[PDB]
């Protein structure tokens, strides 16, 4: 499978959900899954960004968690976990 590569941004998004109730049961499916270079169902959203943020991905973890990660170079990056105003909004 790929490699995880968790960038510390990422990191400090899980903690403060972790200390706001986040259940990472769905997310750890979503990552295993991506590791293994296989599609995510419709509910995740997944997709590619636009503009700034390319060549990133988004999926839909809850309504307000989207995580943000690459692909690249036998890693998975995780980039960001939470909220599209948090994310995005500068928030």
């Not at 590569?5 to 998004?13: A, E, I, M, R, T």
């Amino acid at each position: 499978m790929l490699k995880l590569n968790l960038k510390k941004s990422f990191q400090k998004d899980f903690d403060k959900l972790l200390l706001n109730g986040f259940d990472d049961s769905v997310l750890n499916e979503v990552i295993l899954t991506l590791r293994k270079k296989e599609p995510l169902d419709p509910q995740f959203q997944d997709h590619a960004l636009k503009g700034k943020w390319k060549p990133f991905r988004e999926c839909h973890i809850k309504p307000d968690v989207l995580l943000v990660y690459l692909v690249k170079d036998d890693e998975l990056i995780l980039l960001r976990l939470g909220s599209h105003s948090e994310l995005f909004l500068e928030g």
